[PDB]
Amino acid sequence: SGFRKMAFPSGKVEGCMVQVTCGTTTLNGLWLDDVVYCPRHVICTSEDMLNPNYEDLLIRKSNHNFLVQAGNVQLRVIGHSMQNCVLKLKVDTANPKTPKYKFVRIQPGQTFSVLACYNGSPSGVYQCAMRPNFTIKGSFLNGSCGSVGFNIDYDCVSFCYMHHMELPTGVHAGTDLEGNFYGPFVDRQTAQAAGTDTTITVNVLAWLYAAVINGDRWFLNRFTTTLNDFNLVAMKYNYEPLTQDHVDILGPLSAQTGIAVLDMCASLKELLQNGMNGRTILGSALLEDEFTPFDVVRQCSGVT
Amino acid sequence: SGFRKMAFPSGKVEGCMVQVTCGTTTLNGLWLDDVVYCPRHVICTSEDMLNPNYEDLLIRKSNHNFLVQAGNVQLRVIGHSMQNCVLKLKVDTANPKTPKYKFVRIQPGQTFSVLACYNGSPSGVYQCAMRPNFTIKGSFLNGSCGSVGFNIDYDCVSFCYMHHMELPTGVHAGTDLEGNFYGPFVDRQTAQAAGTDTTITVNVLAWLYAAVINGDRWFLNRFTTTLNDFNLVAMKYNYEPLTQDHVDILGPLSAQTGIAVLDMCASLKELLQNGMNGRTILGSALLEDEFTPFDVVRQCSGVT
Ligand SMILES: *CC(=O)N1CCN(S(=O)(=O)c2cccc(F)c2)CC1
Numbered sequence: 001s002g003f004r005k006m007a008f009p010s011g012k013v014e015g016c017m018v019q020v021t022c023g024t025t026t027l028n029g030l031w032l033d034d035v036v037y038c039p040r041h042v043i044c045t046s047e048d049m050l051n052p053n054y055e056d057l058l059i060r061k062s063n064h065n066f067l068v069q070a071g072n073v074q075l076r077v078i079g080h081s082m083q084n085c086v087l088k089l090k091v092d093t094a095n096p097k098t099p100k101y102k103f104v105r106i107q108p109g110q111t112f113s114v115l116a117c118y119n120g121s122p123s124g125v126y127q128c129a130m131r132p133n134f135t136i137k138g139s140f141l142n143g144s145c146g147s148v149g150f151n152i153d154y155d156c157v158s159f160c161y162m163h164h165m166e167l168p169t170g171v172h173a174g175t176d177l178e179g180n181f182y183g184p185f186v187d188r189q190t191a192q193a194a195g196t197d198t199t200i201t202v203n204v205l206a207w208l209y210a211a212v213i214n215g216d217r218w219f220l221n222r223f224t225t226t227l228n229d230f231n232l233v234a235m236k237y238n239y240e241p242l243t244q245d246h247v248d249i250l251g252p253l254s255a256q257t258g259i260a261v262l263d264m265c266a267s268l269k270e271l272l273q274n275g276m277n278g279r280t281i282l283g284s285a286l287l288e289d290e291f292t293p294f295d296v297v298r299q300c301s302g303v304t
Numbered sequence: 305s306g307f308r309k310m311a312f313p314s315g316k317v318e319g320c321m322v323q324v325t326c327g328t329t330t331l332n333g334l335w336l337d338d339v340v341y342c343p344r345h346v347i348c349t350s351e352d353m354l355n356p357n358y359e360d361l362l363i364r365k366s367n368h369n370f371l372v373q374a375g376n377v378q379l380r381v382i383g384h385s386m387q388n389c390v391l392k393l394k395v396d397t398a399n400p401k402t403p404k405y406k407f408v409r410i411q412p413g414q415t416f417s418v419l420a421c422y423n424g425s426p427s428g429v430y431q432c433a434m435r436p437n438f439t440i441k442g443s444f445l446n447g448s449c450g451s452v453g454f455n456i457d458y459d460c461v462s463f464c465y466m467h468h469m470e471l472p473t474g475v476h477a478g479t480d481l482e483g484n485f486y487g488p489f490v491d492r493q494t495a496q497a498a499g500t501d502t503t504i505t506v507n508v509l510a511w512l513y514a515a516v517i518n519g520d521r522w523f524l525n526r527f528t529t530t531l532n533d534f535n536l537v538a539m540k541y542n543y544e545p546l547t548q549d550h551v552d553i554l555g556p557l558s559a560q561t562g563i564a565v566l567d568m569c570a571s572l573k574e575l576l577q578n579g580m581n582g583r584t585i586l587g588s589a590l591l592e593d594e595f596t597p598f599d600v601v602r603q604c605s606g607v608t
């Protein structure tokens with residue numbers, strides 16, 4: 001019993017983290033096979049960062065200007081290319097610790113683990129969600145860029161995020177491992193405002209199911225609702241619209257608990273309308289939206 | 305910027321997790337050098353667990369009854385002893401992945417990472433605190449016993465917890481790696497009630513400092529207080545008494561923020577008395593007490 005904000009074990013990703021230095025800028029790189037992936041802004045002087053022309057900046061860079069260090073051993077860079085907002089540094093040595101891996105571009109609402117790194121060295125691991133406005137709420141100081149977000153399916157690491165940017169509002173923006181930003185963000189030190197950070201309704205519902213399974217049941221009410229009625233309340237409270245697809249995804253949790261999804265919707269409706277009245281659910285005074293239905297089933301069933 | 309509930313990178317501990325089977329009971333073991341540590345209740349039939357005499361049960365067990373599997377390879381058990389509530393299984397092979405390590409017995413309020421495991425395989429990592437009533441609020445299903453809690457200082461893993469028990473109230477009890485329970489708990493399926501789960505005041509204050517550093521400042525007020533006045537309010541709200549030792553430990557955060565510890569105390573006092581009024585601090589509607597002052601400095605400074 002008990003339900004914790006839980007990250008994937010980080011070992012497989014720890015084995016991939018390197019330090020990348022171009023000129024005076026040091027950040028993190030991901031070493032998979034004989035390629036090191038890192039943010040292209042590694043080539044910028046903080047001056048350059050105001051209006052960088054990366055293709056022009058890159059012309060002035062040779063393989064030998066990219067200093068790649070795996071622990072205390074230097075890797076030989078034998079090639080470099082820009083793909084969107086990442087550099088791919090070809091090294092002469094395949095990472096011996098390369099796990100089975102995929103690059104995936106996640107959807108908003110999807111959760112992942114971040115391995116926060118500085119100088120290619122892991123400092124911590126935490127669980128994130130891709131927000132509906134394509135930001136993440138991370139913990140990233142200077143030097144953390146190139147830290148990656150991942151999911152693990154048994155022995156295959158799906159890399160979904162690389163850290164690039166802090167917005168002026170202290171929220172985080174980054175790319176997939178093909179170097180494409182999540183959302184409208186660009187790797188330039190300019191005015192970039194986030195859109196509405198709406199709540200991930202399907203994740204809240206998953207987490208209410210987790211609470212019932214772990215004995216927290218005070219919020220269960222005598223009511224039901226419809227998708228359309230619920231969605232009127234969701235709209236009012238800056239919750240994402242709930243779709244039949246979301247209802248379908250919550251099916252297994254509905255089955256295990258015997259609480260119809262639309263009944264749990266009606267409970268969430270009362271929680272929005274009435275608040276928590278100083279009570280808590282799984283040790284939270286607010287409605288948690290950084291657990292997916294898949295996360296709830298995983299943790300509640302104990303997948304390794 | 306940003307402040308996350310952050311676990312240590314788990315790789316060094318992943319490399320130590322094995323499966324231990326005695327009869328029909330499978331749980332987790334920690335393999336350090338040529339010793340595998342596991343809960344002694346591995347030898348019990350759930351019947352035995354009602355009133356086990358472990359010394360008597362152990363007489364019926366030989367080295368060959370302890371099945372130890374590291375991945376898909378079996379370890380040869382060449383010795384076994386009981387130390388308090390853990391078994392130490394001597395194996396003929398030193399764990400090649402043994403990190404630098406220590407066994408430490410932590411104090412209540414101290415935080416650590418748990419690597420939740422099933423069948424010797426890591427499923428997730430989360431951050432815990434030793435509660436003032438010597439329980440932890442974990443995520444542990446059947447098979448998770450022998451999962452360990454740890455801190456890392458650069459390259460040295462300090463093992464502080466091994467999971468043994470769920471209390472009827474769904475909170476968790478376990479031992480240090482010398483097999484001594486935290487608190488009054490025993491490895492027997494009997495009535496064991498937890499004492500008052502008081503809030504770790506020094507940790508709340510650390511986390512209020514983290515909030516100021518990350519730009520969450522709405523709760524800062526015009527007031528100060530004294531340790532004695534604050535402690536009267538703490539008592540009333542089931543907060544641990546604040547000592548000069550706690551004030552001393554918060555010194556570095558006080559220095560960096562320019563907020564006197566007793567000023568932050570007065571802010572916490574108003575938060576207790578007035579509540580959050582529907583506002584949040586670092587995305588929390590309650591006062592977080594599972595960050596130590598050391599955790600706040602670590603994450604805010606970026607130690608690896
Ligand atoms: C995005 C990121 O982590 N980095 C690495 C550090 N550099 S920097 O320009 O070297 C720098 C160092 C210290 C303080 C700074 F504000 C920047 C920026 C990109």
Ligand SMILES: *CC(=O)N1CCN(S(=O)(=O)c2cccc(F)c2)CC1
Nearest residue numbers: 328329330331350446447448449468
């Ligand atoms: C404490 C712990 O994790 N374990 C391992 C599992 N066993 S058990 O007796 O094999 C068991 C299996 C399934 C369901 C159970 F309730 C118990 C108990 C000790």
